[PDB]
Design a protein around this ligand. Structure first.
Ligand code: F43
Ligand code: F43
Ligand SMILES: C[C@@H](OP(=O)(O)O)[C@H](NC(=O)CCCCCCS)C(=O)O
Ligand SMILES: O=S(=O)(O)CCS
Ligand SMILES: O=S(=O)(O)CCS
Ligand SMILES: [Cl-]
Ligand SMILES: [Cl-]
Ligand SMILES: [Cl-]
Ligand SMILES: [Cl-]
Ligand SMILES: [K+]
Ligand code: NA
Ligand code: NA
Lengths: 264, 560, 433, 560
C-alpha cells in the first residue's frame, strides 16, 4: 500500500511535525479518566454519558449503502452528545501548533471534527470518542502543561509573554504551579472543580525546544528550512497555473516568469 | 531613494507603551489588576451606572464578564496612530466612539457624481435653450440653495433648517479649463491647484476630457436617518428643481423627465452598486465599494507622490476601518465588533516598518518604483522576503507579537506588507494579489497557524483565482470589491486589497487607479473629513477633537 | 477521449466504457429530466392552507388577523381540489401534467406541464400556475366572495406581492425565487442541503449523485464549463458524483471499518500513482518526493472522489453531519502536504471548507450543514465539488442536528419518494446512455 | 355612544390661526410681505448666512426663489397638532427638523423580535443543558451588558461608550404568566399591566401561547451610521455571546451556529423584509413595512379602545409621517420633500372632524362598532356620505380649503375619513379598502380634479384590485404594504391605509391587527418614542422638547 511521507523538511522541527501527523508521539504523563472528565466539564466523573439521540441499534437506520459499510464509532453507536476539547498553545516553543493538532486528529482518529485557529484548536466528536482523543493528546509530548492548556473559552495567551513562572497567561487562571507541578482546579470553561488535577511538571525550556513543531528565531529559523519554503512555493504556483488553465501548458504560460526553487 | 534605517519603525511605539522595558524579554509579571487599571474602562463603568439609574434597567457592568474576571487581567495597552504622536485608548478607535470614522463613511455615502453634458444637450434639443457660463453660474447658485432642502419654485413650502444641513453642497468640475475659469471659484473644484505634483492635473484633465460634472454631497443628517440609496435620488430631485428655475422651464414638462433619468441613471456615477439578496443593501453602501474607488478617494497621492508607501498605508487605514470596523463589524454583524482587527493595520507603525523594509529590499534588488518584472517569480520573491522579515520581527520583539495578539491581524499585516511591496515594485495590482496569497501560505507553515477559524476562505481560494478568467472568479483587482464572491464575508482582507491596489498605481506614478472622477471629487477640501491624511483624522476622532456633521443640537432640549 | 465505467449505489457495475460526454448535463436525457422535474414540480401543503384559514394565521411568524378566519377544509376535499388543479393547469390532454394527493389529503404533488416552462423565461411557472389554480379551486369549492377570497389567496401565496417570495405560503419548490440568485446561472445551485438529503431518502450514494448533477448543471449555466473547462467539470461530476470506476464506493468500503480522513488521503495518492495520473517529479535532500500531475484534470477528479469518500468515512463514523466542514478542509490540506500537488479545485474546496467550518461553529451566520447550498455565500466558491459532500454528510447524520431534514424538508421527502430519477439516479443516468 | 357636536372640530384651529376672521369670507387682502413676515424663515435666512461665511460658499438664501419673489407672498400659516394645543411653524414638522419623527423611525428600524424556544431546545438537545428561570435570569443580565456593545468572553476587548448606546436594551415577553413572574420585572414586558382594558391581555396571551420572545432594540447610533439591515445581525451576535456565557458553552462550537441560525432567521421576526432591485433596500426599512405591522406598533388602542377613532387617527399620524415624509420624501426622493402631504392628515383637527362625522353617521344608521354589513353596498353608502360632507366643509369654509391647498391632501383626507368610517363600522379592512377608492372617484367628479399628476395610479387600479385574487394583485390589506406593486411610488396613501387597517380592528374591538408579537413589543415604555400618543410626540419634536437617542456630544469637541 502507499507509504505516507506526510510533510517535507529536514530539521528536528520537521521531524516533530511528522511525529504529530503520523501519531508517533511519546506518552509523557498519566491523567486519570476521572480527572480528565472533570477538566472537560461535560458530565460528572463516573456519570452515564448523556445522549442526543437513541442508540443506533434501538432506533434503526435508513437503508443507506454508506451507513452499511462504515462502522460507527462507539460514541456514535451509543448516541452520545457531540462534545469537545479545546487547547491553546504558546508561540514560545510549545510542543504543538494548531494545524498539526488538527492533522494529528484527522489522520489518527475516526469520526472527528477538528478546527484550527490562531489562539485555540478544537476537536469535536461524540463524547466518549472525544475523551479518548483528548487523553491521547494531553498525555503525550504534544502537551507541556505550562505552555498549553484546556481552554473552552477566554483563550487569550498564545501570543503573549509568558508569566515569570513560565505559565502561559490565562485570564481565568484555570491552572497554576504547586510544588513544581501544574495543577488544574477549574474546568475548561472556567468553573471551579472540586479537585486538583495534577498535570505534572512543565517541560524545561530546552526540552520544549527539542519537542516543538514551531519555527522561530530562537529555535529552528524558518528562513533556513528551504524544503518547506519550496513546498509552499510549488503549491502556490501550481494553484495559480491551474486556475488559469488546468493543463501542463499553464506551467509556462506568459506571466509565470523564471520561477525557481531551492532544493528541486 | 528611500533607505531603510537601522532602528525598526515600530520601536518608538513599544518604548512609549512600556517605558523602561527590555524589549527582548519573553516573560512579564502579571498583576491581574482588572478594569481599575484603565481610565477608559473606569469611565465606562461610571457611565453604565448613570445609564442604569436613568432608565431603571441594568446595562454596562464590567463584572458581567464571564469567569469572575473583569477585562485587564493582563495590561490593557493603548494605541499610537501610525505616523502620528497621538496615543489613544483602544476604545477610542471603536467606530461608535469615533466621529472621524463615522464622518469618513458618511462623506462617501452622501456623495454622487452627476454628469452635466447630457442635461445640457437635453435643454438644447428639446427646448432650444443656449447653455452658457452665465446660465451655468445661475444654475450653480440655484442648486446650492436647493440641494440642502430649500424651495425655489412653489409657494408655502417648508424647508430644512440650514444649520442642520451645513455640510451639503454641490461643486462642478471639468477638464475644460476655459469653462472652469469662467465660473465663480466657490463653485468649482480646481484640478490645477489640487493636483500640482508630477503633472497629475494634466493626467486627470486628459482622462476626463472636455466634459462637465457635478460633485454632489447630500446632507449627513439625511443618510443618517435613511441610507445610501437616498443619495442619488436626493441629488437628482434638487438638480431637477434647479434646472427648472435656471432655464425657465415648465415646472414639470416632458423634458424634465429626461433630466431626471440623466441625473438618476444615465449620467450618475454611484460610489457603489447594489448587493444580492442575502446581504441586500441599497446603492452607496460599503459592500458595493470597489477597491479601485476606495483607493481613489484617498488623497495622499496628490500631496506626496514621491513617497508611494505613505499614500499606500493611508489607503490601508481608510479601507481597513471602513470595511472591517463599519461594514463587516456593524452592517454585516455588530456588537463589540472588529476594532483591533483593523487597528493592527494603522497603529504602532508596524505595517509601516514591514512595508518600508520591503520597499528598500525591492529598490535595491529590482530598481526604481514600478520597474520590477510583472510575473509570479517576482511576487514569490518579494512576498517571501517581506513575510519572513516580519515574522522574525514578531519573534524577536515579544511586545510586538503581543500587540498583534490575534493571528488574523498578523496575517493581514504580513500579507499587506508583501503585496504593497510587490505593487510598488511592479506597478501591477494583479501581480501584487499573487504576492498577498503567497504571504499567507508562507505564514501558515512557519507557525502552524494563520488567522481565525474562517480567515483563509479567500486565502485558500486565492492563488488560483488571481489568474482565473472564469465568470465569477476572474476580475482585475481594481474592479473587485467587498462583493467579489470569495471576499464577501471576512475581516482582515478588504481594506488591505484597497491599499495595495493604491500601491500599484503609486509605484507606477499614476494620478489615480480606477476613476478620475472619483479622484477629483474627493480632493475637494470642502468635505468634512480630510481625505488627504486618514490616520491624522482618526487620531482627532479618538481624542474627541473631530467635529462631525449631522448633529441635532439645534432642535433638541437640554436642561438639568 | 475519456471513458468511464458506471457503477450503482451498491458498488455493482452498470455500464462499461461510457464516453464522458454521455453523462454531460447537455446530453444525458436522465440529467435533463432531473432538471426539468425540479423546475416544474411543486409541493402543496393543503394542511397548511387549512390551518392558515381556520386560524387566520396568514403569512406565518405568529401573525394572526382577528376576525378574518375562513372556515374551509381542503384536506377533506383533496381529491376534488387536485382534479380541478389538474384541469386548470394542463395544456393538452395526455401531456406531462401530474397532480397527486399525498399524505391522506395533507399535501399535493403538482408537476406542471413542461410547455408552461418552455413558454416562459425562467422556472417559476410551476409555482405561479399551481398557486393560481389552487386559489381558484378553493374559491369555487367553498363559494368564496369578494372580501374573503383575498385572505384565502394569502393562505396559498403567503405575503406575495408585498414580498418577492411566497413567504409564509403553502406552495413549495426545491428551488428558490430567481431574485435570490447570487449571480448569473445560480438557480440550480440554490438547493438546500436538507432538501437534497430528502430527495435521496438518505441514501448517501444517491445523494452524492443528485447533488453533484444539479451543482454541475448550475456550473454549466454559469458559463464555467466551456472549452477545456468542460472536461475539468465533467471529470469531477463523473468521479465525485457518479461513482465512476467505483472509486468513491470502493475507497469508502476500504476505509469504512477503521479508516480516517488521513487514510483516505493515502489511498487517493496511491491510486493516482498506480493509475499513472501522477508521478514522482523530484526528490528533496530529506527524501521527500515532489509529485507531478501527468493529467491535471484527472488529478483533480481523483482528489474530488477522495474528498467524497473521506466525508463518507469520517461523517459516517461520527454519524454526524458537522464533520464535513473539517473533512473537506483537512483532506485537501493534507493531500497537498503529502504530494506538493494542489488539492481539489486548486484550493477552492479547502477554502470553501475554511469558511464553512467557521460559519458552522461561530456566532456570525451559517448554521448546521443542512442550511447550506451552492448559492449560499459561504459555500458557493467551488464549482460543484463541495456541496455534494455537504448533502451526503447531512444524509448520514443519525440525529445530532437541530435543523434537520425531517424538521425543515419533510414535504420534500413525501413529494419525491416515488419519483424515479430521485429513487435511483445512478441507474437512471446509466440507462439513459 | 359618540355624538357628533354642533361645532365642527376644525373650527378651533381656524380661529387660532386667524384671530378675528369671518370664516365665511371667500376673499382676502394680499399684502405680499415675503419671508420677513415669518419668524422661522427669518431664522433660516440668518442660519444660511452663518453657514456660507463659515464654509466660504453660498447655501440657503430666500432670494434665490425664482421670479424675484420670496416665500410668503400670501400669508404663511402655522399648524396645530390634532388633539394638541401646540401650534407650530410648518418647518418644525419637516422630518429633518423634528427629532421626534426621526426617533420614531429609528425605534422601529432598530427593533427585532427573536424567539427563545428554539435556542432553549438547542441547548437541551445538543448540550443536555437544563433551562430554568435562574439560567434565563443570568442570560438576561448578560444580554443587557453585551447588546449595547460590551464584552463578556475575550480579554483585551474595546467597547462602546455606554452613554452613546443608552437606548439599547433587551426585554423578554411570554404568554406563560408563571415564567414572566419569576424573572426580575426590569427584564420583562408585563402584558397584564400594559393591556388591562377590554381583556386585551388575555387575547394577546392566547395568541402568543406559552412561547418566549426577546424584544431587542439595538443602539440608535448604529442604525444611523448604518442601515436597518444591521438590526437582526447585531441582535444575533450579542444573543449568541450571551448564550455562550450563560450556559458555559464552548465559545464557538457547532451548537453555537444553530443558535445563530435561530436568532438570524428561523426565530427572527423582522419589522420589514427586503425590496426589489429598482428600490433595493435592506430589511427593516419602510418600503417593506406592512400596514398591519404599522398599525400594531401604535399603542393608543391599549389606552382607550372605547374610542376607536382616536387610535385610528394616531395610526394615520404614524403612517403618514413615516411613509410620506421619511420613506417617499427622503429614501425614495429627497429635497424639501413631502411635509404638508402628510401634515394634512395629522394637523388642524380636519381629518378628525370628517371621521367623527362619519362615525356618528354610521352608528346611527348601522349600529354599534363593527356590526355593519361587510359588503360593497355599505362601503358605497359610507364613502359617499363622508366624502360629500367633507367636500361641503371645504366649500363652506374657505380657510379650510386654503389649509389643504393641494388636491392630493384633500383626496387622502376625504378618502381616509371614508375608509376609517367604513373600517370602524364593518370591522373589515378589505371592505374599507373599497370605500377608500370610492371616495376618490366621487371627489374627482365633483371638482373636476383630484391630486397631483400621478396621484391616482393606485386609485384607478384600485377598485378592481381590492377583490382580485390574481398573484400580484390579490392581497388582504393587513399584509399589503409599501411594496404592494400599485402602492410602491406615491404620496397620500400608505399611512392612510395603515390607519384604516387599524380602524377595522378597532371597530371589531380586537387587541391587534396582524401580529401580537409586534403589539407587545411596541407597548414597552422603555422605548424612546411614546408609541401610545403619536401626535403629542410630534408636537414635542416641533417644539424642540423631544430628546432623541444617538447624539455624539460625548465624543466631539465644542469650543468657540
Ligand atoms: C466566541 C468566539 C467565537 C465567535 O464566533 N466569535 C468569538 C467572540 C467574538 C466577540 C467577542 C466579544 C466578547 O468577548 O464578548 C466579538 C467582539 C464579536 C462581537 N460579538 O462583538 C469578536 N469575537 Ni473573536 N475577536 C477577536 C479575535 C479573536 C481571536 C483571539 C485570539 C487571542 O489569542 O486572543 C480568536 C480567533 C483565533 O484564535 O484566531 C477569537 C475567537 C472568538 N471570537 C471566540 C471566543 C474566543 C475566546 O473564547 O476567548 N477571536 C482576534 O484575533 C483579534 C480581534 C478580536 C475581535 C475584537 C477587535 O477586533 O477589537 C473579536 C471579535
Ligand atoms: C416642479 C413640480 C413638478 C415636480 O415634479 N414636482 C413639483 C415641485 C416639487 C418640489 C418643490 C420645491 C420647490 O418649490 O423648489 C417638492 C418640494 C419636492 C422636492 N424636490 O423637494 C415638491 N414638489 Ni410639488 N409639492 C406639493 C404639492 C404640489 C401641488 C401644489 C398645488 C398648489 O395649488 O399649490 C402641485 C400638483 C397639483 O397641482 O396637484 C405640485 C406640483 C409640482 N411639484 C411642480 C411645480 C408646481 C409649481 O410650478 O408651482 N406640487 C401639493 O399639492 C402639496 C404638497 C406639496 C409638497 C411639499 C410638502 O408636502 O410640504 C411639494 C413636493
Ligand atoms: C454568511 C451570511 O449569514 P447567513 O448565513 O445568511 O445568516 C452573512 N453574514 C456574514 O457574511 C457575516 C460577515 C461579518 C461577520 C464575520 C466576519 S469574519 C449575512 O448576514 O448575510
Ligand atoms: O473563533 S472564530 O474564528 O469563529 C471568530 C473570531 S472573531
Ligand atoms: O406636479 S407633479 O404632480 O408632477 C408633482 C407634485 S409634488
Ligand atoms: Cl494535463
Ligand atoms: Cl507573573
Ligand atoms: Cl479552452
Ligand atoms: Cl388684495
Ligand atoms: K442610516
Ligand atoms: Na440647541
Ligand atoms: Na461632550
Amino acid at each position: 500500500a502507499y507509504t505516507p511521507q506526510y510533510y517535507p523538511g529536514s530539521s528536528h522541527v520537521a521531524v516533530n511535525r511528522r511525529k504529530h501527523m503520523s501519531g508517533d508521539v511519546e506518552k509523557l504523563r498519566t491523567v486519570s479518566d476521572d480527572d480528565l472528565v472533570a477538566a472537560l466539564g461535560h458530565r460528572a466523573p463516573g456519570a452515564d454519558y448523556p445522549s442526543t439521540h437513541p442508540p443506533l441499534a434501538e432506533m434503526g437506520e435508513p437503508d443507506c449503502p454508506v451507513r452499511q459499510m462504515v462502522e460507527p464509532t462507539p460514541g456514535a453507536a451509543a448516541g452520545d452528545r457531540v462534545r469537545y476539547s479545546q487547547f491553546t498553545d504558546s508561540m514560545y516553543s510549545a510542543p504543538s501548533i494548531p494545524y498539526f493538532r488538527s492533522y494529528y486528529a484527522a489522520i489518527n482518529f475516526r469520526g472527528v471534527d477538528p478546527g484550527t485557529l490562531s489562539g485555540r484548536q478544537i476537536v469535536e466528536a461524540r463524547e466518549r470518542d472525544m475523551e479518548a482523543q483528548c487523553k491521547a493528546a494531553i498525555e503525550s509530548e504534544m502537551t507541556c502543561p505550562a505552555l498549553a492548556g484546556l481552554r473552552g473559552c477566554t483563550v487569550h495567551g498564545h501570543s503573549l509573554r509568558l508569566a515569570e513562572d513560565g505559565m502561559m497567561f490565562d485570564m481565568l487562571q484555570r491552572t497554576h504551579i504547586e510544588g513544581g507541578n501544574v495543577i488544574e482546579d477549574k474546568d475548561q470553561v472556567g468553573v471551579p472543580i472540586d479537585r486538583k488535577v495534577n498535570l505534572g511538571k512543565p517541560m524545561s525550556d530546552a526540552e520544549a525546544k527539542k519537542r516543538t513543531t514551531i519555527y522561530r528565531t530562537d529555535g529552528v529559523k524558518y528562513r533556513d528550512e528551504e524544503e518547506v519554503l519550496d513546498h509552499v512555493h510549488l503549491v502556490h504556483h501550481r494553484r495559480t497555473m491551474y486556475g488559469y488553465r488546468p493543463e501542463t501548458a499553464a506551467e509556462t504560460a506568459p506571466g509565470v516568469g523564471p520561477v525557481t526553487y531551492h532544493t528541486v | 531613494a528611500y533607505k531603510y534605517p537601522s532602528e525598526k519603525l515600530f520601536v518608538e511605539a513599544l518604548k512609549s507603551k512600556f517605558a523602561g522595558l527590555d524589549l527582548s524579554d519573553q516573560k512579564v509579571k502579571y498583576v491581574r489588576a482588572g478594569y481599575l487599571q484603565n481610565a477608559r474602562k473606569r469611565e465606562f463603568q461610571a457611565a453604565g451606572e448613570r445609564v442604569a439609574e436613568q432608565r431603571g434597567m441594568q446595562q454596562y457592568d464590567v463584572n458581567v464578564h464571564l469567569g469572575g474576571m473583569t477585562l485587564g487581567q493582563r495590561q490593557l495597552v493603548p494605541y499610537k496612530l501610525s505616523t502620528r504622536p497621538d496615543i489613544v485608548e483602544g476604545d477610542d478607535l471603536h467606530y461608535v466612539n469615533n466621529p472621524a470614522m463615522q464622518q469618513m463613511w458618511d462623506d462617501m455615502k452622501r456623495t454622487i457624481i452627476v454628469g452635466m453634458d447630457l442635461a445640457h444637450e437635453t435643454l438644447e434639443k428639446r427646448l432650444g435653450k443656449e447653455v452658457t457660463p452665465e446660465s451655468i453660474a445661475g444654475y450653480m447658485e440655484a442648486v446650492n440653495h436647493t440641494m440642502p432642502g430649500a424651495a425655489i419654485v412653489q409657494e408655502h413650502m417648508v424647508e430644512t433648517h440650514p444649520g442642520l444641513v451645513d455640510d451639503c453642497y454641490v461643486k462642478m468640475f471639468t477638464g475644460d479649463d476655459e469653462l472652469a475659469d469662467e465660473i465663480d471659484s466657490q463653485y468649482v473644484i480646481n484640478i490645477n491647484d489640487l493636483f500640482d505634483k508630477e503633472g497629475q492635473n494634466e493626467k486627470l484633465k486628459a482622462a476626463i476630457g472636455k466634459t462637465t460634472w457635478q460633485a454632489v454631497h447630500i446632507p449627513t443628517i439625511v443618510v443618517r436617518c435613511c441610507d445610501g440609496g437616498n443619495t442619488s435620488r436626493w441629488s437628482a430631485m434638487q438638480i431637477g428643481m434647479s434646472f427648472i428655475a435656471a432655464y425657465n422651464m415648465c415646472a414639470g414638462e416632458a423634458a424634465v423627465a429626461d433630466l431626471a433619468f440623466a441625473a438618476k441613471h444615465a449620467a450618475a456615477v454611484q460610489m457603489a452598486e447594489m448587493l444580492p439578496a442575502r446581504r441586500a443593501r441599497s446603492p452607496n453602501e460599503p459592500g458595493g465599494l470597489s477597491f479601485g474607488y476606495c483607493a481613489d478617494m484617498v488623497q495622499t497621492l496628490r500631496v506626496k507622490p514621491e513617497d508611494p508607501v505613505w499614500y499606500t498605508l493611508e489607503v490601508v487605514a481608510c479601507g481597513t476601518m471602513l470595511y472591517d470596523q463599519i461594514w463587516l463589524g456593524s452592517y454585516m454583524s455588530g456588537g463589540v465588533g472588529f476594532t483591533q482587527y483593523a487597528t493592527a493595520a494603522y497603529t504602532n507603525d508596524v505595517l509601516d516598518d514591514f512595508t518600508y523594509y520591503g520597499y528598500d529590499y525591492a529598490l535595491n534588488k529590482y530598481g526604481d518604483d514600478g520597474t520590477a518584472p510583472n510575473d509570479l517569480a517576482t511576487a514569490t520573491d518579494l512576498a517571501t522576503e517581506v513575510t519572513l522579515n516580519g515574522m522574525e520581527c514578531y519573534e524577536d520583539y515579544p511586545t510586538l507579537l503581543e500587540d498583534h495578539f490575534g493571528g488574523s491581524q498578523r496575517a493581514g499585516i504580513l500579507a499587506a506588507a508583501s503585496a504593497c511591496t510587490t505593487g510598488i515594485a511592479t506597478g501591477n495590482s494583479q501581480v501584487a494579489l499573487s504576492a498577498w496569497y503567497m504571504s499567507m501560505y508562507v505564514h501558515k507553515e512557519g507557525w502552524g497557524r494563520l488567522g481565525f477559524f474562517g480567515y483563509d476562505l479567500q486565502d485558500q481560494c486565492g492563488a488560483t483565482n488571481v489568474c482565473s478568467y472564469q465568470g465569477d472568479e476572474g476580475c482585475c483587482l481594481e474592479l473587485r470589491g467587498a462583493n467579489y464572491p470569495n471576499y464577501a464575508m471576512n475581516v482582515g482582507h478588504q481594506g488591505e486589497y484597497a491599499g495595495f491596489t493604491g500601491s500599484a498605481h503609486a509605484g507606477a506614478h499614476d494620478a489615480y487607479c480606477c476613476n478620475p472622477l472619483i479622484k477629483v471629487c474627493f480632493a475637494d477640501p470642502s468635505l468634512v473629513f480630510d481625505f488627504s491624511y486618514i490616520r491624522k483624522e482618526y487620531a482627532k476622532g479618538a481624542m474627541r477633537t473631530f467635529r462631525p456633521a449631522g448633529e441635532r443640537s439645534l432642535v433638541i432640549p437640554a436642561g438639568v | 477521449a475519456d471513458t468511464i465505467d458506471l457503477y450503482d449505489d451498491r458498488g455493482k457495475k452498470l455500464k462499461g466504457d461510457v464516453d464522458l460526454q454521455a453523462v454531460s448535463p447537455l446530453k444525458n436525457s436522465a440529467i435533463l429530466s432531473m432538471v426539468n422535474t425540479v423546475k416544474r414540480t411543486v409541493a402543496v401543503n393543503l394542511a397548511g392552507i387549512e390551518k392558515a384559514c381556520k386560524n387566520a394565521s396568514y403569512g406565518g411568524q405568529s401573525r394572526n388577523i382577528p376576525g378574518r378566519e375562513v372556515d374551509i377544509d381542503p384536506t377533506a376535499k383533496a381529491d376534488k381540489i387536485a382534479a380541478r388543479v389538474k384541469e386548470l393547469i394542463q395544456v393538452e390532454k395526455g401531456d406531462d401534467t401530474e397532480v397527486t394527493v399525498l399524505g391522506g389529503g395533507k399535501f399535493l404533488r403538482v408537476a406542471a406541464p413542461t410547455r408552461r416552462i418552455e413558454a416562459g423565461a425562467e422556472y417559476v411557472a410551476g409555482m405561479t400556475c399551481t398557486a393560481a389554480a389552487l386559489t381558484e379551486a378553493l374559491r369555487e369549492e367553498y363559494n368564496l366572495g369578494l372580501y374573503d377570497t383575498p385572505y384565502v389567496k394569502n393562505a396559498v401565496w403567503g405575503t406575495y406581492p408585498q414580498t418577492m417570495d411566497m413567504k409564509g405560503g403553502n406552495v413549495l419548490s426545491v428551488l428558490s425565487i430567481p431574485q435570490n440568485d447570487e449571480g448569473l446561472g445560480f438557480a440550480l445551485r440554490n438547493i438546500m442541503a436538507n432538501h437534497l438529503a430528502m430527495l435521496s431518502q438518505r441514501n448517501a450514494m444517491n445523494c452524492a449523485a443528485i447533488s453533484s448533477i444539479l451543482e454541475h448543471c448550475g456550473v454549466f449555466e454559469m458559463g464555467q464549463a466551456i472549452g477545456l473547462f468542460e472536461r475539468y467539470q465533467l471529470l469531477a461530476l463523473a468521479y465525485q458524483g457518479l461513482n465512476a470506476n467505483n472509486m468513491v464506493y470502493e475507497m469508502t468500503k476500504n476505509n469504512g471499518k477503521t479508516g480516517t480522513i488521513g487514510t483516505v488521503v493515502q489511498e487517493t495518492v496511491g491510486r493516482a500513482l498506480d493509475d499513472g495520473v501522477i508521478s514522482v517529479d523530484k526528490t528533496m535532500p530529506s527524501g521527500y518526493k515532489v509529485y507531478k500531475a501527468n493529467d491535471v484534470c484527472m488529478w483533480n477528479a481523483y482528489c474530488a472522489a477522495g474528498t467524497m469518500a473521506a466525508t463518507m468515512v469520517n461523517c459516517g463514523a461520527l454519524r454526524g453531519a458537522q464533520a464535513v466542514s473539517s473533512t473537506l478542509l483537512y483532506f485537501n490540506d493534507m493531500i497537498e502536504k503529502e504530494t506538493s500537488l494542489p488539492g481539489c479545485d486548486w484550493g477552492r474546496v479547502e477554502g470553501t471548507a475554511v469558511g464553512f467550518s467557521f460559519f458552522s461553529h461561530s456566532i456570525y451566520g451559517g448554521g448546521g450543514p443542512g442550511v447550506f447550498n451552492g448559492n449560499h455565500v459561504v459555500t458557493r466558491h467551488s464549482t460543484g465539488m463541495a456541496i455534494p459532500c455537504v448533502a451526503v454528510a447531512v444524509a448520514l447524520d443519525a440525529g445530532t442536528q437541530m435543523f434537520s431534514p425531517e424538521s425543515t424538508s419533510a414535504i420534500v421527502l413525501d413529494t419525491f419518494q416515488d419519483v424515479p430519477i430521485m429513487m435511483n439516479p445512478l441507474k437512471e443516468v446509466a440507462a439513459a446512455v
